[PDB]
């Protein structure tokens, strides 16, 4: 029973906690043990949901937070109706306005380090990348940040509040030094 586990459960809403638990268990991982992983998945999930709420109604299809099979099923339907190339790895959203998949990343390092890593691995030229840090920095493919500044600002604010909350509980150092 870790302090980080209890922090996560009282920092994120239950819908996000529940989805993060399912995601970890789907790959045989325990939120009770891999607690920094637990906190990172919850954080990333909330960012994805705030991101999808930033556009017009029906702008984004949400891929994240789904079962592996249903996630690829929705990706298949999108590709087979828009003609967009199927990505090698699961993205997080699809943008019906810009007609591209989005892989969101949240990093405790400098944004550009994590971007380079995700690009190289993704190997999907068309999949748009959007990285947020816990320091208010962001980095997006082709300097195209998709959303307007106000919707990105509230994401960056939330991420910094999570950071302060961990720090006030002496959990931030372990969280940063575990990525
Ligand atoms: C399962 C899906 N994953 C993997 N993995 C994911 C995850 C989920 C369950 C168990 C382990 C891990 C690796 S740790 C981590 C840390 C923070 C947020 C998400 C995650 N990702 C890391 C960064 C992402 O941007 C992202 O989209 C994912 C993601 O979606 C996949 F694409 F592989 F099918
Ligand atoms: Mn994802
Ligand atoms: Mn992601």
Residue numbers in the entry: -2 to 53, 73 to 195
Give sentences copied directly from the paper behind this entry.
The influenza virus RNA-dependent RNA polymerase (RdRp) is a trimeric complex with multiple active sites and functionalities. The acidic polymerase (PA) protein component of the RdRp plays a critical role in viral gene transcription by mediating the process by which the polymerase performs “cap snatching” from host messenger mRNAs. The RdRp endonuclease activity that is necessary for this to occur is located within the ≈200-residue N-terminal domain of PA (PAN). RO-7 is a next-generation PA endonuclease inhibitor of influenza A and B viruses, but its drug resistance potential is unknown.
In addition, we previously reported that the resistance-associated PAN substitution E119D emerges in response to the first-generation endonuclease inhibitor L-742,001 (8), and we therefore also determined the complex structure with this mutation at 2 Å. Both complexes show no significant differences from the WT complex. In the case of the E119D substitution, the holoenzyme only has one bound metal ion at the two-metal active site, but the second metal ion is restored to the active site by the coordinating groups provided by RO-7, as seen in the E119D–L-742,001 complex. Sequence encoding a loop-deleted version (residues 51 to 72 replaced with a GGS linker) of the PAN WT or the point mutation (I38T or E119D) from CA/04 was synthesized and inserted in pET-28a(+) expression plasmid (Genescript, Piscataway, NJ), expressed in BL21(DE3) cells, and purified by affinity chromatography and gel filtration (Protein Production Facility, SJCRH).
